Amino acid sequence: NNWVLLSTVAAVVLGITTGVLVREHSNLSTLEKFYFAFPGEILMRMLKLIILPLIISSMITGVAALDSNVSGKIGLRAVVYYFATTLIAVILGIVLVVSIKPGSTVDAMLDLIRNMFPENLVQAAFQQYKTKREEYKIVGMYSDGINVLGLIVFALVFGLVIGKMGEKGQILVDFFNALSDATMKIVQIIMWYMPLGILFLIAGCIIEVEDWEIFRKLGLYMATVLTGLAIHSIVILPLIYFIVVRKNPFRFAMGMAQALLTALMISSSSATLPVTFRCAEENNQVDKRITRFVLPVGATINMDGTALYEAVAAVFIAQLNDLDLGIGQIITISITATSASIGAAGVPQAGLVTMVIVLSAVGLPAEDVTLIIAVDCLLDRFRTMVNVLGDAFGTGIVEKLSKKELEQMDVS
Ligand SMILES: [Hg+2]
Ligand code: NA
Ligand code: NA
Ligand code: NA
Protein backbone atom coordinates (compact mmCIF):
# COMPACT_ATOMS: atom_id res chain seq x y z
CA ASN A 1 0.00 0.00 0.00
CA ASN A 2 0.94 3.70 0.25
CA TRP A 3 2.03 3.55 3.90
CA VAL A 4 5.09 5.63 2.97
CA LEU A 5 2.89 8.63 2.16
CA LEU A 6 0.73 8.06 5.25
CA SER A 7 3.76 7.69 7.53
CA THR A 8 5.40 10.90 6.30
CA VAL A 9 2.11 12.82 6.45
CA ALA A 10 1.59 11.64 10.03
CA ALA A 11 5.05 13.02 10.82
CA VAL A 12 3.89 16.52 9.87
CA VAL A 13 0.94 16.33 12.25
CA LEU A 14 3.08 14.83 15.01
CA GLY A 15 5.95 17.18 14.20
CA ILE A 16 3.82 20.31 14.48
CA THR A 17 2.08 18.99 17.61
CA THR A 18 5.39 17.98 19.20
CA GLY A 19 7.13 21.24 18.29
CA VAL A 20 4.37 23.50 19.60
CA LEU A 21 3.90 21.58 22.85
CA VAL A 22 7.66 21.22 23.38
CA ARG A 23 8.22 24.92 22.64
CA GLU A 24 5.45 25.96 25.05
CA HIS A 25 5.83 23.45 27.90
CA SER A 26 9.64 23.67 28.09
CA ASN A 27 12.46 26.21 27.86
CA LEU A 28 15.21 24.39 25.98
CA SER A 29 18.65 25.98 25.96
CA THR A 30 20.31 26.72 22.64
CA LEU A 31 22.38 23.56 23.09
CA GLU A 32 19.33 21.55 24.19
CA LYS A 33 17.35 22.66 21.13
CA PHE A 34 20.13 21.38 18.86
CA TYR A 35 20.12 17.91 20.42
CA PHE A 36 16.32 17.75 20.16
CA ALA A 37 16.50 18.01 16.36
CA PHE A 38 19.35 15.50 16.09
CA PRO A 39 17.20 12.80 14.41
CA GLY A 40 16.37 15.40 11.77
CA GLU A 41 20.06 16.22 11.41
CA ILE A 42 20.90 12.60 10.61
CA LEU A 43 18.23 12.47 7.91
CA MET A 44 19.79 15.49 6.22
CA ARG A 45 23.15 13.71 6.31
CA MET A 46 21.54 10.65 4.73
CA LEU A 47 19.89 12.78 2.03
CA LYS A 48 23.06 14.77 1.32
CA LEU A 49 25.02 11.51 1.32
CA ILE A 50 23.11 10.19 -1.70
CA ILE A 51 22.83 13.20 -4.02
CA LEU A 52 26.32 12.75 -5.48
CA PRO A 53 25.70 9.14 -6.64
CA LEU A 54 22.14 10.17 -7.51
CA ILE A 55 23.22 13.07 -9.73
CA ILE A 56 26.29 11.43 -11.29
CA SER A 57 24.60 8.14 -12.14
CA SER A 58 21.22 9.53 -13.22
CA MET A 59 22.80 12.19 -15.44
CA ILE A 60 24.97 9.62 -17.21
CA THR A 61 22.25 6.99 -17.66
CA GLY A 62 19.61 9.45 -18.84
CA VAL A 63 21.81 11.03 -21.49
CA ALA A 64 23.44 7.75 -22.52
CA ALA A 65 20.12 6.03 -23.23
CA LEU A 66 19.16 8.69 -25.77
CA ASP A 67 20.51 8.04 -29.25
CA SER A 68 23.39 10.21 -30.42
CA ASN A 69 21.35 11.84 -33.19
CA VAL A 70 18.41 12.91 -31.00
CA SER A 71 20.27 13.46 -27.71
CA GLY A 72 21.24 16.98 -28.75
CA LYS A 73 17.75 18.05 -29.80
CA ILE A 74 16.12 16.71 -26.62
CA GLY A 75 18.85 18.27 -24.49
CA LEU A 76 18.35 21.60 -26.24
CA ARG A 77 14.59 21.36 -25.67
CA ALA A 78 15.01 20.66 -21.95
CA VAL A 79 17.50 23.49 -21.39
CA VAL A 80 15.27 26.05 -23.12
CA TYR A 81 12.32 24.99 -20.96
CA TYR A 82 14.38 25.19 -17.77
CA PHE A 83 15.74 28.69 -18.34
CA ALA A 84 12.44 29.94 -19.77
CA THR A 85 10.56 28.90 -16.63
CA THR A 86 13.32 29.95 -14.21
CA LEU A 87 13.56 33.40 -15.81
CA ILE A 88 9.77 33.70 -15.76
CA ALA A 89 9.84 32.67 -12.10
CA VAL A 90 12.41 35.35 -11.25
CA ILE A 91 10.54 37.98 -13.26
CA LEU A 92 7.31 37.01 -11.51
CA GLY A 93 9.00 37.14 -8.11
CA ILE A 94 10.74 40.46 -8.75
CA VAL A 95 7.52 42.05 -10.00
CA LEU A 96 5.85 40.95 -6.77
CA VAL A 97 8.37 42.43 -4.32
CA VAL A 98 8.34 45.84 -6.00
CA SER A 99 4.53 45.67 -6.09
CA ILE A 100 3.75 44.16 -2.68
CA LYS A 101 6.84 45.74 -1.10
CA PRO A 102 7.20 43.38 1.89
CA GLY A 103 9.98 45.59 3.26
CA SER A 104 32.10 42.10 -7.64
CA THR A 105 29.02 41.68 -9.82
CA VAL A 106 31.05 40.16 -12.66
CA ASP A 107 33.24 38.04 -10.38
CA ALA A 108 30.15 36.23 -9.09
CA MET A 109 29.13 35.34 -12.64
CA LEU A 110 32.64 34.25 -13.61
CA ASP A 111 32.85 31.96 -10.57
CA LEU A 112 29.83 30.17 -12.05
CA ILE A 113 31.69 29.38 -15.28
CA ARG A 114 34.82 28.55 -13.29
CA ASN A 115 32.62 25.96 -11.55
CA MET A 116 31.09 24.42 -14.68
CA PHE A 117 34.64 23.27 -15.52
CA PRO A 118 36.33 22.30 -12.25
CA GLU A 119 40.06 21.66 -12.12
CA ASN A 120 39.54 18.28 -10.42
CA LEU A 121 36.62 15.85 -10.41
CA VAL A 122 37.46 14.36 -7.01
CA GLN A 123 37.75 17.81 -5.44
CA ALA A 124 34.61 19.00 -7.25
CA ALA A 125 32.71 16.25 -5.43
CA PHE A 126 32.98 18.15 -2.13
CA GLN A 127 34.58 21.57 -2.81
CA GLN A 128 33.64 24.72 -4.71
CA TYR A 129 35.65 27.54 -6.26
CA LYS A 130 35.33 31.18 -5.21
CA THR A 131 37.24 34.27 -6.36
CA LYS A 132 37.54 37.59 -4.53
CA ARG A 133 39.19 40.88 -5.42
CA GLU A 134 42.03 41.73 -3.05
CA GLU A 135 45.06 44.00 -2.84
CA TYR A 136 43.17 44.86 -7.14
CA LYS A 137 43.94 41.32 -8.32
CA ILE A 138 41.59 38.35 -8.37
CA VAL A 139 42.60 35.50 -6.04
CA GLY A 140 40.75 32.19 -5.91
CA MET A 141 40.36 29.57 -3.21
CA TYR A 142 38.52 26.23 -3.16
CA SER A 143 36.10 26.62 -0.27
CA ASP A 144 33.77 23.85 0.88
CA GLY A 145 30.46 22.74 -0.60
CA ILE A 146 29.75 20.11 -3.25
CA ASN A 147 30.12 21.48 -6.78
CA VAL A 148 26.82 20.28 -8.21
CA LEU A 149 27.18 22.53 -11.26
CA GLY A 150 30.58 21.10 -12.15
CA LEU A 151 29.66 17.43 -11.76
CA ILE A 152 26.59 17.73 -14.00
CA VAL A 153 28.48 19.52 -16.79
CA PHE A 154 30.86 16.55 -16.65
CA ALA A 155 28.25 13.82 -16.24
CA LEU A 156 26.27 15.26 -19.16
CA VAL A 157 29.39 15.33 -21.33
CA PHE A 158 30.45 11.90 -20.06
CA GLY A 159 26.97 10.55 -20.72
CA LEU A 160 26.95 11.88 -24.28
CA VAL A 161 30.34 10.36 -25.07
CA ILE A 162 29.85 6.82 -23.75
CA GLY A 163 26.52 6.75 -25.57
CA LYS A 164 28.26 7.66 -28.83
CA MET A 165 31.09 5.13 -28.43
CA GLY A 166 28.57 2.33 -28.91
CA GLU A 167 29.44 -1.28 -28.13
CA LYS A 168 32.87 -0.11 -26.94
CA GLY A 169 31.10 1.87 -24.21
CA GLN A 170 28.21 -0.46 -23.38
CA ILE A 171 30.02 -1.56 -20.21
CA LEU A 172 30.03 2.00 -18.85
CA VAL A 173 26.34 2.32 -19.74
CA ASP A 174 25.67 -0.96 -17.94
CA PHE A 175 27.82 0.04 -14.96
CA PHE A 176 26.05 3.37 -14.47
CA ASN A 177 22.63 1.87 -15.20
CA ALA A 178 23.16 -0.48 -12.26
CA LEU A 179 24.74 2.26 -10.16
CA SER A 180 21.62 4.35 -10.79
CA ASP A 181 19.29 1.52 -9.76
CA ALA A 182 21.39 0.83 -6.67
CA THR A 183 20.97 4.49 -5.72
CA MET A 184 17.23 4.26 -6.37
CA LYS A 185 16.95 1.45 -3.82
CA ILE A 186 19.17 3.14 -1.23
CA VAL A 187 16.85 6.15 -1.34
CA GLN A 188 13.96 3.78 -0.59
CA ILE A 189 15.88 2.57 2.46
CA ILE A 190 16.03 6.21 3.58
CA MET A 191 12.28 6.46 2.97
CA TRP A 192 11.71 4.15 5.95
CA TYR A 193 13.62 6.40 8.36
CA MET A 194 12.15 9.58 6.89
CA PRO A 195 9.02 9.78 9.10
CA LEU A 196 11.29 9.87 12.15
CA GLY A 197 13.50 12.53 10.58
CA ILE A 198 10.61 14.73 9.45
CA LEU A 199 8.99 14.53 12.88
CA PHE A 200 12.05 16.31 14.29
CA LEU A 201 12.99 18.50 11.32
CA ILE A 202 9.52 20.06 11.50
CA ALA A 203 9.43 20.03 15.31
CA GLY A 204 12.94 21.45 15.58
CA CYS A 205 12.08 24.19 13.09
CA ILE A 206 9.16 25.60 15.08
CA ILE A 207 11.16 25.41 18.32
CA GLU A 208 14.05 27.68 17.24
CA VAL A 209 11.74 30.57 16.29
CA GLU A 210 11.89 31.94 19.84
CA ASP A 211 9.81 35.13 19.82
CA TRP A 212 6.74 34.31 17.72
CA GLU A 213 6.35 37.94 16.61
CA ILE A 214 9.15 37.59 14.04
CA PHE A 215 6.55 35.97 11.78
CA ARG A 216 4.44 39.13 11.99
CA LYS A 217 7.43 41.16 10.79
CA LEU A 218 8.00 38.54 8.07
CA GLY A 219 4.28 38.10 7.41
CA LEU A 220 4.13 40.25 4.28
CA TYR A 221 7.40 38.81 2.97
CA MET A 222 5.92 35.36 3.60
CA ALA A 223 2.89 36.15 1.45
CA THR A 224 5.08 37.47 -1.38
CA VAL A 225 7.00 34.19 -1.64
CA LEU A 226 3.91 31.98 -1.41
CA THR A 227 2.00 34.28 -3.77
CA GLY A 228 4.76 33.98 -6.36
CA LEU A 229 5.02 30.23 -5.84
CA ALA A 230 1.23 29.93 -6.06
CA ILE A 231 1.03 32.09 -9.19
CA HIS A 232 3.88 30.22 -10.91
CA SER A 233 2.63 26.71 -10.16
CA ILE A 234 -1.12 27.32 -10.56
CA VAL A 235 -1.17 29.72 -13.51
CA ILE A 236 2.10 29.99 -15.43
CA LEU A 237 3.34 26.39 -15.43
CA PRO A 238 -0.14 25.00 -16.25
CA LEU A 239 -0.47 27.71 -18.91
CA ILE A 240 2.83 26.75 -20.55
CA TYR A 241 1.73 23.11 -20.39
CA PHE A 242 -1.63 23.75 -22.07
CA ILE A 243 -0.08 25.93 -24.78
CA VAL A 244 2.37 23.24 -25.89
CA VAL A 245 0.68 19.89 -25.31
CA ARG A 246 -2.93 21.18 -25.38
CA LYS A 247 -4.01 18.79 -22.62
CA ASN A 248 -5.56 19.44 -19.21
CA PRO A 249 -2.58 20.63 -17.13
CA PHE A 250 -4.37 19.89 -13.85
CA ARG A 251 -4.87 16.23 -14.78
CA PHE A 252 -1.10 15.93 -15.30
CA ALA A 253 -0.45 17.74 -12.02
CA MET A 254 -3.07 15.57 -10.31
CA GLY A 255 -1.16 12.41 -11.17
CA MET A 256 2.02 13.79 -9.60
CA ALA A 257 0.17 14.28 -6.30
CA GLN A 258 2.33 11.60 -4.67
CA ALA A 259 5.45 13.38 -5.92
CA LEU A 260 4.04 16.82 -5.11
CA LEU A 261 2.71 15.81 -1.69
CA THR A 262 5.94 13.93 -1.01
CA ALA A 263 8.00 16.96 -2.05
CA LEU A 264 6.18 19.15 0.48
CA MET A 265 6.75 16.80 3.42
CA ILE A 266 10.47 16.21 2.83
CA SER A 267 11.38 19.44 1.01
CA SER A 268 14.05 17.86 -1.22
CA SER A 269 13.83 17.52 -5.00
CA SER A 270 16.51 14.81 -5.27
CA ALA A 271 15.06 12.66 -2.49
CA THR A 272 11.65 12.72 -4.20
CA LEU A 273 13.16 12.04 -7.63
CA PRO A 274 12.34 8.30 -7.30
CA VAL A 275 8.73 9.30 -6.64
CA THR A 276 8.71 11.68 -9.61
CA PHE A 277 9.88 8.94 -11.97
CA ARG A 278 7.07 6.55 -10.99
CA CYS A 279 4.32 9.19 -11.00
CA ALA A 280 5.28 10.65 -14.37
CA GLU A 281 5.95 7.31 -16.07
CA GLU A 282 2.97 5.49 -14.48
CA ASN A 283 0.16 7.95 -13.70
CA ASN A 284 0.81 10.13 -16.78
CA GLN A 285 2.17 7.35 -19.05
CA VAL A 286 5.17 9.37 -20.17
CA ASP A 287 8.12 7.97 -22.11
CA LYS A 288 10.83 6.43 -19.94
CA ARG A 289 13.58 7.88 -22.13
CA ILE A 290 12.40 11.47 -21.63
CA THR A 291 11.68 11.04 -17.92
CA ARG A 292 15.08 9.51 -17.14
CA PHE A 293 16.82 12.55 -18.68
CA VAL A 294 14.62 15.61 -18.09
CA LEU A 295 14.00 14.91 -14.40
CA PRO A 296 17.51 14.17 -13.01
CA VAL A 297 18.99 17.29 -14.60
CA GLY A 298 15.84 19.22 -13.75
CA ALA A 299 16.00 18.18 -10.10
CA THR A 300 19.17 20.27 -9.63
CA ILE A 301 19.49 22.99 -12.29
CA ASN A 302 15.74 23.58 -12.83
CA MET A 303 14.53 25.13 -9.57
CA ASP A 304 11.85 27.65 -10.49
CA GLY A 305 10.60 28.12 -6.93
CA THR A 306 14.08 28.67 -5.52
CA ALA A 307 14.88 31.18 -8.27
CA LEU A 308 11.68 33.03 -7.41
CA TYR A 309 12.67 32.75 -3.75
CA GLU A 310 16.23 34.04 -4.10
CA ALA A 311 15.12 37.09 -6.09
CA VAL A 312 12.14 37.82 -3.83
CA ALA A 313 14.10 37.53 -0.59
CA ALA A 314 17.22 39.34 -1.82
CA VAL A 315 15.13 42.34 -2.87
CA PHE A 316 13.10 42.06 0.34
CA ILE A 317 16.26 42.16 2.46
CA ALA A 318 17.40 45.16 0.41
CA GLN A 319 14.25 47.04 1.44
CA LEU A 320 15.08 46.20 5.06
CA ASN A 321 18.54 47.70 4.52
CA ASP A 322 16.76 50.79 3.10
CA LEU A 323 18.83 50.91 -0.09
CA ASP A 324 17.09 52.06 -3.26
CA LEU A 325 16.59 49.40 -5.94
CA GLY A 326 16.20 51.07 -9.32
CA ILE A 327 16.05 49.45 -12.73
CA GLY A 328 19.82 49.35 -13.18
CA GLN A 329 20.68 47.37 -10.06
CA ILE A 330 17.75 44.91 -9.93
CA ILE A 331 19.12 43.19 -13.05
CA THR A 332 22.05 41.58 -11.24
CA ILE A 333 19.56 40.09 -8.78
CA SER A 334 17.66 38.60 -11.71
CA ILE A 335 20.83 37.17 -13.24
CA THR A 336 22.32 36.06 -9.91
CA ALA A 337 19.04 34.57 -8.69
CA THR A 338 18.86 32.42 -11.82
CA SER A 339 22.53 31.48 -11.41
CA ALA A 340 22.14 30.69 -7.70
CA SER A 341 19.20 28.36 -8.37
CA ILE A 342 21.31 26.57 -10.99
CA GLY A 343 24.07 25.67 -8.53
CA ALA A 344 21.76 24.87 -5.61
CA ALA A 345 21.79 21.20 -4.65
CA GLY A 346 18.56 19.23 -4.47
CA VAL A 347 18.57 19.22 -0.67
CA PRO A 348 16.60 21.18 1.99
CA GLN A 349 18.14 24.56 3.03
CA ALA A 350 19.96 24.62 -0.36
CA GLY A 351 18.41 28.08 -0.80
CA LEU A 352 20.03 29.40 2.38
CA VAL A 353 23.57 28.37 1.40
CA THR A 354 23.29 29.89 -2.09
CA MET A 355 21.81 33.08 -0.62
CA VAL A 356 25.35 34.38 -0.10
CA ILE A 357 25.92 34.54 -3.86
CA VAL A 358 22.86 36.73 -4.41
CA LEU A 359 23.25 38.67 -1.16
CA SER A 360 26.89 39.55 -1.83
CA ALA A 361 26.38 40.57 -5.46
CA VAL A 362 23.57 43.02 -4.69
CA GLY A 363 25.75 44.58 -1.99
CA LEU A 364 24.32 43.23 1.27
CA PRO A 365 25.92 41.72 4.38
CA ALA A 366 26.37 37.96 4.12
CA GLU A 367 24.85 37.49 7.61
CA ASP A 368 21.42 38.87 6.66
CA VAL A 369 20.24 35.32 5.90
CA THR A 370 19.68 34.99 9.65
CA LEU A 371 16.99 37.68 9.36
CA ILE A 372 14.77 35.39 7.26
CA ILE A 373 16.00 31.95 8.40
CA ALA A 374 13.17 31.71 10.93
CA VAL A 375 10.51 31.03 8.28
CA ASP A 376 12.71 29.63 5.50
CA CYS A 377 11.73 26.13 6.61
CA LEU A 378 8.06 26.81 5.89
CA LEU A 379 8.85 28.51 2.58
CA ASP A 380 11.34 25.76 1.71
CA ARG A 381 8.53 23.22 2.07
CA PHE A 382 6.54 24.82 -0.75
CA ARG A 383 9.53 25.72 -2.94
CA THR A 384 10.26 22.04 -3.48
CA MET A 385 6.71 21.32 -4.63
CA VAL A 386 7.19 24.04 -7.25
CA ASN A 387 10.69 22.74 -8.01
CA VAL A 388 9.45 19.21 -8.70
CA LEU A 389 6.28 20.51 -10.35
CA GLY A 390 8.33 22.59 -12.77
CA ASP A 391 10.48 19.57 -13.58
CA ALA A 392 7.40 17.33 -13.65
CA PHE A 393 5.71 19.60 -16.19
CA GLY A 394 8.94 19.72 -18.18
CA THR A 395 8.76 15.98 -18.78
CA GLY A 396 5.35 16.34 -20.41
CA ILE A 397 6.34 19.43 -22.39
CA VAL A 398 9.65 18.00 -23.62
CA GLU A 399 8.04 14.66 -24.48
CA LYS A 400 5.35 16.34 -26.59
CA LEU A 401 7.83 18.40 -28.61
CA SER A 402 10.26 15.46 -28.81
CA LYS A 403 7.56 13.21 -30.30
CA LYS A 404 9.38 12.93 -33.63
CA GLU A 405 12.65 11.97 -31.94
CA LEU A 406 10.93 9.30 -29.84
CA GLU A 407 9.13 7.93 -32.90
CA GLN A 408 12.43 7.23 -34.67
CA MET A 409 13.94 5.81 -31.46
CA ASP A 410 11.47 2.93 -31.04
CA VAL A 411 12.63 1.75 -34.47
CA SER A 412 16.38 1.67 -33.82
HG1 LIG B 1 10.77 23.35 9.36
NA1 NA C 1 13.32 26.50 -14.76
NA1 NA D 1 14.31 20.79 -9.80
NA1 NA E 1 19.82 24.14 -8.14
Curated annotation (Swiss-Prot):
Glycosylated. Glycans are attached at residue 27. It is found in: Cell membrane; Apical cell membrane; Synapse, Synaptosome; Early endosome membrane. Na(+) 1 binds at residues 82, 85-86, 298, 302, 304, 387, 391. Residues 67-77, 166-174, 245-249, 281-289 are cytoplasmic. Residues 250-280, 330-363 dip into the membrane without crossing it. It catalyses: K(+)(in) + L-glutamate(out) + 3 Na(+)(out) + H(+)(out) = K(+)(out) + L-glutamate(in) + 3 Na(+)(in) + H(+)(in); K(+)(in) + L-aspartate(out) + 3 Na(+)(out) + H(+)(out) = K(+)(out) + L-aspartate(in) + 3 Na(+)(in) + H(+)(in); D-aspartate(out) + K(+)(in) + 3 Na(+)(out) + H(+)(out) = D-aspartate(in) + K(+)(out) + 3 Na(+)(in) + H(+)(in); K(+)(in) + L-cysteine(out) + 3 Na(+)(out) + H(+)(out) = K(+)(out) + L-cysteine(in) + 3 Na(+)(in) + H(+)(in). GO terms for molecular function: chloride transmembrane transporter activity; cysteine transmembrane transporter activity; D-aspartate transmembrane transporter activity; glutamate:sodium symporter activity; high-affinity L-glutamate transmembrane transporter activity; identical protein binding; L-aspartate transmembrane transporter activity; L-glutamate transmembrane transporter activity. Residues 23-45, 203-222, 317-329, 364-376 are extracellular. One of its GO terms (biological process) is L-aspartate import across plasma membrane. L-aspartate binds at residues 267, 269, 306, 347, 383-384, 387. One of its GO terms (cellular component) is perikaryon. Expressed in all tissues tested including liver, muscle, testis, ovary, retinoblastoma cell line, neurons and brain (in which there was dense expression in substantia nigra, red nucleus, hippocampus and in cerebral cortical layers). Coiled coil: none annotated. Keywords: Amino-acid transport, Cell membrane, Chloride, Disease variant, Endosome, Glycoprotein, Membrane, Metal-binding, Phosphoprotein, Potassium, Schizophrenia, Sodium, Symport, Synapse, Synaptosome, Transmembrane, Transmembrane helix, Transport. Na(+) 2 binds at residues 300, 341-342, 344. The chain crosses the membrane at residues 3-22, 46-66, 78-98, 142-165, 175-202, 223-244, 290-316, 377-398. It is a multi-pass membrane protein. Contains eight transmembrane regions plus two helical hairpins that dip into the membrane. These helical hairpin structures play an important role in the transport process. The first enters the membrane from the cytoplasmic side, the second one from the extracellular side. During the transport cycle, the regions involved in amino acid transport, and especially the helical hairpins, move vertically by about 15-18 Angstroms, alternating between exposure to the aqueous phase and reinsertion in the lipid bilayer. In contrast, the regions involved in trimerization do not move. PANTHER family: EXCITATORY AMINO ACID TRANSPORTER 3, SODIUM/DICARBOXYLATE SYMPORTER-RELATED. Belongs to the dicarboxylate/amino acid:cation symporter (DAACS) (TC 2.A.23) family. SLC1A1 subfamily. Homotrimer. Interacts with ARL6IP5. Interacts with RTN2 (via N-terminus); the interaction promotes cell surface expression of SLC1A1. Interacts with SORCS2; this interaction is important for normal expression at the cell membrane. It is linked to Dicarboxylic aminoaciduria: An autosomal recessive disorder characterized by abnormal excretion of urinary glutamate and aspartate, resulting from the incomplete reabsorption of anionic amino acids from the glomerular filtrate in the kidney. It can be associated with intellectual disability. Schizophrenia 18: A complex, multifactorial psychotic disorder or group of disorders characterized by disturbances in the form and content of thought (e.g. delusions, hallucinations), in mood (e.g. inappropriate affect), in sense of self and relationship to the external world (e.g. loss of ego boundaries, withdrawal), and in behavior (e.g bizarre or apparently purposeless behavior). Although it affects emotions, it is distinguished from mood disorders in which such disturbances are primary. Sodium-dependent, high-affinity amino acid transporter that mediates the uptake of L-glutamate and also L-aspartate and D-aspartate. Can also transport L-cysteine. Functions as a symporter that transports one amino acid molecule together with two or three Na(+) ions and one proton, in parallel with the counter-transport of one K(+) ion. Mediates Cl(-) flux that is not coupled to amino acid transport; this avoids the accumulation of negative charges due to aspartate and Na(+) symport. Plays an important role in L-glutamate and L-aspartate reabsorption in renal tubuli. This is Excitatory amino acid transporter 3.
